[PDB]
Structure formats: C-alpha cells, structure tokens
Design a protein around this ligand. Sequence first.
Ligand SMILES: [Cl-]
Ligand SMILES: [Cl-]
Ligand SMILES: [Cl-]
Ligand SMILES: [K+]
Ligand SMILES: [K+]
Ligand SMILES: [K+]
Lengths: 225, 225, 225
Amino acid sequence: GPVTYTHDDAIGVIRMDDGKVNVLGPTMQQALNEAIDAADRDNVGALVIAGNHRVFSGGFDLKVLTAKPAIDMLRGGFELSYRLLSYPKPVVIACTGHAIAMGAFLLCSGDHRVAAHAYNVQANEVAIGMTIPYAAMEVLKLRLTPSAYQQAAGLAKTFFGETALAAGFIDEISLPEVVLSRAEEAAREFAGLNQQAHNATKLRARAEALKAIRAGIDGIEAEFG
Amino acid sequence: GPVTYTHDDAIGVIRMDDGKVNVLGPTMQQALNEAIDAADRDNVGALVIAGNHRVFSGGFDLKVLTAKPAIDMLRGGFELSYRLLSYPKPVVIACTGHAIAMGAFLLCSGDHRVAAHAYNVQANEVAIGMTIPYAAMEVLKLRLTPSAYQQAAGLAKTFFGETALAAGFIDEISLPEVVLSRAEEAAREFAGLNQQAHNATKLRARAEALKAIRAGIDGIEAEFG
Amino acid sequence: GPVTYTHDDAIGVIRMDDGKVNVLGPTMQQALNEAIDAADRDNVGALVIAGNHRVFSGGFDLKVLTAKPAIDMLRGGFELSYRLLSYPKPVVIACTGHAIAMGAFLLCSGDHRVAAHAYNVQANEVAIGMTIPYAAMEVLKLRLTPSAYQQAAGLAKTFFGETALAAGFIDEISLPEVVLSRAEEAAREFAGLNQQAHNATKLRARAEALKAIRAGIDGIEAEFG
Ligand SMILES: [Cl-]
Ligand SMILES: [Cl-]
Ligand SMILES: [Cl-]
Ligand SMILES: [K+]
Ligand SMILES: [K+]
Ligand SMILES: [K+]
C-alpha cells in the first residue's frame, strides 16, 4: 500500500509513498487513516508524517476533482487535517519534498514542520482555476502571517526555505538528507512534554479554527454538490 | 488632473501626481475613482496604482481634516480602500515613495505591494494627535503581524525596507528605478491567474475585514460629526 | 521591598528585584501594583517595567501554584497584564534577563519590549505539566505570529534574540548593558506622542483581547477551584 507505519520506541512514523507524487485520493486517505489508527492503538508519544524522496504531496487526485466522489475526497482530505490538528500527541511533519495544494494544507496540519531549503510550498488553486475551500482557508489562516495568508491564497504564491519559514508554512529548515531524521528527533523531544498539558493547550490554541474547519467540512456539498 | 490612467494590453495603470505629495483630498479621490471606473470599463486583467517620483501619498488633506467635508473625505478614503480590497482583479501597488497615514492604508489595500528599501511607511496619526479610525485599523489588522499592528497603530512606528516587509506593510522590495516597472510586470503575471478563482478566494480571505471596514465607514459620523 | 519606583522627568521606572528570580507571587504583585499606583499619582508620560540583572521574571511562585491562594495569585498576575495592556500611557518593558511563563506574559503586556540577544523567552508550562490559562493564551495571541503562537503555547518553544523578535515576543534587540537605558530612552520618546490618541488607538488595537483576558480572569476559579 501507499503508506508505511513504523512504531519506534516513543514515536510512530507514517511514510507516504505511492511511487509517484503521493496524491491524497481515496486510496491514500484510507491508508493514512489506517496508519493513524495504528499509532492510536500503540498510544505513541508523538507521530511523524513523511512524504517520499521526491515530494511531500502534490495534493488531491485532480482526475477525481475534475460530484459525489469529488465531495468525498474533499471531505476526507479536510477531515485528515482536522484529525492531525486535534491529535492529542505532538505531530511532526517531515516535509521531504514539495507540498502543493492539499499537500500544503496537510503540511500545515501538524505541530512542528521540517523542510529543506529548496522545497516549494504552494496553494496553487487560483493558478489552475480552483477556488480554495473554506476548510483549507482556515488551515492556512491558522499558520500563515496575515500578509502571507493573503498572498498564498489569493495569488497562489510559492514559498520555500527562508520565505516559507517567515510566512508560517514551515517551522524549521534542515538539510534535505536529515529532514526525516530531524523530524523523528523532534518528535522524540516533544514526546517528553506533558501530554495532557500539550493537548489541553493546543486545543485552546486552535478552538475557533477547529470549529470553522468542521463548518467548512460540513459545507462542502453546498460548494461541489 | 492629478491622476493618469493608461490601458496596457492585459493591465490598467493608475498614476497619482498632483505635483506635491498626492494628498487624498476630495479632488484626488474623485480622480482615482474615475480612473478605476475606466479600468472597469476596459475590463483590465490587473490594475496598478502608483504614486509620483517623490511619494506614494502623504495621506489625507489635513487642512480639510483640521465637520461634514472632513467626514466626506474620511468616508471616501476608506471607501477607496474597500473598493481596492474587493476589486475582482489583482491590484498591485507601486509604492514609489513614502506612504503615510491614509497613504499607508491605501498601500495596504492592494494584493501585492512593491516598494524600495528607503521608503518610509507609517501611520503617523498618534504622533500628531489623531486617533486612527476604525476602518483604518481593520485595514492595518488585515496585513500587519500581530506585534507590528500594535506598534504601527499605537506608537506611530515607521517601517521601511526589510522591516516593512517583515511587518506586512509591503510584499516585495525592488530597486527604486524599477518599482513601477516591477509592479507592472507583477500585474501582468497576476492577470494570468484564473480571475474567478482569484476573486472568490480573495473575498474568503477578507470576509470579516470587509464587513468591519463597511461598519467603520458607516460609523464615521459618530466619530467626526 | 522587591520593587523600586523612580520618577524621572517625563517617565516612571519600576524595577523588580527580590534578590532571586522575581517570581510574581502575592508579595511581588502587591509591590508592582503599588508602584504603578505611584506612577498614576505622578501622571507619568510613559512607564518602564524592568527586571534585575539576572532575569526579567521566572514566572509565578510555583510553590503556591503546586486552591484559593493559587487562584488569587493567578488572578492577580493576569490582572496585572490587563492593567499594563490598558495603561493610558506608553509602557516599555526592559527585559533585563530571561522571561518565563508569567514573566513572558508580563513581557507581552507592554507597548514596546526591549531585550538582549541571549535572553530566553518561553512559556514553559506544557514542559512542566501545566495547561496555559485562557487569559495567558489571549496575551500570547495578541503579540505572537500565528505560527509562533502555536509553538510557544503547545510546544513550550524557547525564543531569543532574532527568533524572539520575528516571533513577536519582543520588539527591539539591544546590547545587554543598554537594555534598561534604551527602554528609558524609548519611553521618553513615546511620552512625546499624543497621549489621548495613543490611548484611544491602543484600546481599539486591543478591544477583543482585553474582553477575552477579562473573561479568562473571571473563569480562573472554574479551572483551579
Ligand atoms: Cl468549501
Ligand atoms: Cl472611526
Ligand atoms: Cl484558565
Ligand atoms: K483544494
Ligand atoms: K486617519
Ligand atoms: K501559567
């Protein structure tokens, strides 16, 4: 399958690799959800989500998006963001290559985000004639600076490295060969925080956003129906 | 008149030059509105707003501000911000010199803002004994970082170059001799985005702010009446 | 006592030094409140709050926090933040060493915040098993970038120098030997702003946050009761 789950002492590691660009279609979404179910079963201290050697994720499966299967894929994508944003343990994203559209929203759904200098991060929807869904806007608004939010969304601006960090698309820049190892190291460090206080505090930090993402998930049919 | 409009293939270019500091009094406001009407008529792909060689704009005509003519000038200034923030095409600001008070709010009313390193950007109201209007606060809050918003507003802090960029007062720094040419280049690039998706997305990115600016415009009489 | 107040022409200067780490227990809180009362009596043009040579403040007195005395200390700490955030004159923080937990929230309660490169600023609550109070979250949210807010709160991230400045924990970096002198200089400069416009504008910039801090103060018993 397109997802590999490993349980490594204090952490769970989930690696996406569909042999292509890790599109978040129904197959990948199911595989991710099952992997997180496995982490839940193991009661991991922290969880790493990684891409493959060429990308984090290129986004949704656009063949599907281009009514019901498209709606289900959209809902499932944003439900995954919600699941990771409300995860009771720290979540670290190993952004192992570019993160585009739903890949960028997924990247913005973890607590700590590690990327290499060259990796592009872009909500390219407007450049290809798609309006950004309300749930995705809320995910962006939660992390981007006010001015980077405007440009990322309305102008499909591409960020990388220092601009991605300043914008709020990522939290740490690492050399490409250590993005995954550094994400795993960070996750081990974060598993040392008090879990109860971490979860209580992250939810306070995200209360309005999580409500609005839920509303955005509920309203998908009223946009792509 | 103080405004020149030119239609250049995919873009409209509006250049302010009253031979002084481009104060946004009733004459300039009418001239700007008529120029945007002309862009609307031409159905331009993107719109550039530029200052003159010495300033973007020094702000309102303070002789007028220092009840009804002052109220009308205030309302018209913030209505222009609203018009540009809700413009259905990309708007690029060529910040060709300093942008002070209403000039800064106008600067913050476009999608992409280009300035040179040396150009000061400042809401100087508090330094000269004026409370910042509610509509202007909303314009600032939409673009500035949380901490830069506090300082810009409450302390009349002056920004330029790297500090203006980090703060969220501008989006791009160019050499002074290419601010206008770079703004026009960017506008041509943005005219290539899908217009419908751009507009739908920018409005989602600005929904609350636009409502609050409207409320701030409506409440002007209750402050300067 | 642990607080020294001096009145120096246009400014008041309040210096914390309990001979240790300036914990914000009931004794320090009372001493701070009495010092601000003295500044109010003098109608100072601006107010400086400083730590000692080793710290700004290490936070609350954790012996007390580890029900009623803990509730009173919590309420009083956040009431001090509210008092400084709504102060009608400019408030400058001389962050003379590290600022941890309530020390960081106090640091975030002034208009202009000066620190040296090496000084750590951290809400360490989650690292030591404490959930961050709602009033403290609102203080952080008012100043930190969206992404720095998430990390500061949920991951107990430590900031200093350029990262503290970019994050929105401080506004100015000075050499350690001039943090206090620079804070006093800045306060003199800010006393030159129009007081009435400063206060009217800062309150507009803080309206929602101040309401939410008040709600957070009121709800303390429902969390530590
Ligand atoms: Cl939607
Ligand atoms: Cl007003
Ligand atoms: Cl609380
Ligand atoms: K999308
Ligand atoms: K004004
Ligand atoms: K606390």
